[PDB]
Amino acid sequence: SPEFMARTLQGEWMKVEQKGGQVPAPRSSHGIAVIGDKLYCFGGEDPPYESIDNDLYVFDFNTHTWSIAPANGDVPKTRVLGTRMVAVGTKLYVFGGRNKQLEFEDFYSYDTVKEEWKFLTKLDEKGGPEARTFHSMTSDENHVYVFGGVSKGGLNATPFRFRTIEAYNIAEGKWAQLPDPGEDFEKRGMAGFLVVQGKLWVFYGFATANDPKIPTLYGSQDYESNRVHCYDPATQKWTEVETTGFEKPSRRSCFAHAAVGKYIIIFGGEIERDPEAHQGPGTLSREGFALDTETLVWERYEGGPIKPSNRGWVASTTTTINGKKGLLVHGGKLMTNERTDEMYFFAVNSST
Amino acid sequence: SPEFMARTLQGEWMKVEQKGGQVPAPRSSHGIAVIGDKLYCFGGEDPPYESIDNDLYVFDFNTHTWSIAPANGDVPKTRVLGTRMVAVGTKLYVFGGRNKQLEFEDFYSYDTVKEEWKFLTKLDEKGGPEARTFHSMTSDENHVYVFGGVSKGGLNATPFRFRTIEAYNIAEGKWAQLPDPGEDFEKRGMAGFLVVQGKLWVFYGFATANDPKIPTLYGSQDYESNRVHCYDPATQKWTEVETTGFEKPSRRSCFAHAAVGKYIIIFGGEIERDPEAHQGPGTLSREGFALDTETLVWERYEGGPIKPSNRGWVASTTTTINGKKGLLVHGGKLMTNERTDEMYFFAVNSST
Numbered sequence A, B: 001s002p003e004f005m006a007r008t009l010q011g012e013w014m015k016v017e018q019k020g021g022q023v024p025a026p027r028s029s030h031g032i033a034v035i036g037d038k039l040y041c042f043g044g045e046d047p048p049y050e051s052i053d054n055d056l057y058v059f060d061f062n063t064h065t066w067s068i069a070p071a072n073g074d075v076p077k078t079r080v081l082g083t084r085m086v087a088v089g090t091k092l093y094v095f096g097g098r099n100k101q102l103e104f105e106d107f108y109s110y111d112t113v114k115e116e117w118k119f120l121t122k123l124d125e126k127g128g129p130e131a132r133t134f135h136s137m138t139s140d141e142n143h144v145y146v147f148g149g150v151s152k153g154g155l156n157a158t159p160f161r162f163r164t165i166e167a168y169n170i171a172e173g174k175w176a177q178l179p180d181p182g183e184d185f186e187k188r189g190m191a192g193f194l195v196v197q198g199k200l201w202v203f204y205g206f207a208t209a210n211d212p213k214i215p216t217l218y219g220s221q222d223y224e225s226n227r228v229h230c231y232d233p234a235t236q237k238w239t240e241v242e243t244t245g246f247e248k249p250s251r252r253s254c255f256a257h258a259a260v261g262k263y264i265i266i267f268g269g270e271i272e273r274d275p276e277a278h279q280g281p282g283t284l285s286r287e288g289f290a291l292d293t294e295t296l297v298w299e300r301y302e303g304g305p306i307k308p309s310n311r312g313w314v315a316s317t318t319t320t321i322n323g324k325k326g327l328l329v330h331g332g333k334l335m336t337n338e339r340t341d342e343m344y345f346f347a348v349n350s351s352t
Ligand code: NA
Pocket: A036, A037
């Protein structure tokens, strides 16, 4: 064991070459997911507060080219920002997001084999999953999960944030809300949300305050979280997790995140609020951190000469490229306040 | 007492109008100080790693115009970056900084009445104050104080950081090193350093690691500090100060800072390292924080519609403008990596 400590999580940052095709306009606040060797991309924001399109873009990692998936079936009726998309088996699932006119996307699947959309659930109905934007999503073998986000405004309410998870059982075609973690747990948008070794992790994100003593900043108490909780479906219990380390990341939201084995791997994110909400970029991070969910220790990671610049509001997912599992980062906004079309992959080398 | 908490330190950010005159080129890593209604400016960096000039620029707050002070006497022989300047009585004191060729500025005064420079001390001599760059400075009635910074490289050493304070007794014309705070105290450059209600405060800054277990980032263990110490000249004792608050600022260096009554007031700063040291801007903050040195509580402050953008490596000082004490911020680098000529003043309204 050398005197000087080398970093534990080792890997390489790579910029993914995009050769061409029907390439998506730059975007933030969108959803991506991978099935096999293909990345799917839906939704997005650019310019600020404006949605863009409702095409389903497909990037092939072997050919490094983009195409547009056939727009068959129940094509999603709204072009949205603040949306998310996950993959389970050969289907993609899109939930929520909204446009500037406050119309929210309902719940749809896309069958990548038959190449068709299916409308699955109308949101915001009595006893069903609510309309949400800037929520987070993850999935496992038989569920799509939605955490947090911001609600739809109505006559007698302004939008608020959620602290709940809605779970869609794919085989049964049924939604259920998971146990509510209660008042000590922050309602948040753009939080980290992942299945890791069978359990659900909710971490960091952009929180509603539950304390009138927290002073406002730019007229709102809203702040960046650094808290971490775990839900075990096997027992249906919530626990708050104390995480440690000299390099524990400062409070942040809107970051790339993925699970690789025991690691939660993040990159970028909003570390300071913009004075004008989402109009400007606030302050965005250029750093990557990983949490060992077994030891509960955070450490930064580095990936060689390729260093992605400051960014947040990216789409992210886990995939495997050239036999390496890792964190895929696509799009987002930069400190120039421009959207980017850049795609980066942190390829993990060490054991997980 | 209302249910919802208003901010304690209240004030107004103002952009100081600069009408014209012999206006200084944009710069970071320079020194400013005020005597009466005049701001003095010396040194600076632009482009990265390059010094600029050795003029003493003078801004009159009543006329809002710049001039160049007569270059009489022992004009400082080197154009430097990483320099600092303080005012005591009607004299300015310039210490250190270096140029790209690793020549360091010695210790000079400028007499604002007689309008002449005097060479006071050759640095880096046996038993005397060392050559330093990226040190911090403050002063009181009869002393100029230098804290931290980076040393001059020689044959058998690379530059290192200091954890000591050198104190120049103006009346006696003599330097002395203050008690060394020891190994648990971080050697730092670009740290906060102020006299507050008679005591010396050292806070945050850019630290050398004293633990081979801290992993390197971009090839160096160097990291941003969040520690706070106080030295009382009356007893000659050091104490580490535990500061608190939900809005305690994340680790940072290279920030604007000033003392107003019981408050240490800061703005901006490097919150993430650049991959290439000082070549790029790293990640810079757009937030202001204040520490009540009596209660030891940190809180953010806000100043109305004028919100200075992300910046660090600014020059800063305390002054009074239109009967309001506050924090003066001049120059620095922006997240575009450009230097700025902008000048901002946070005018304090509440009791201190
Ligand atoms: Na394939």
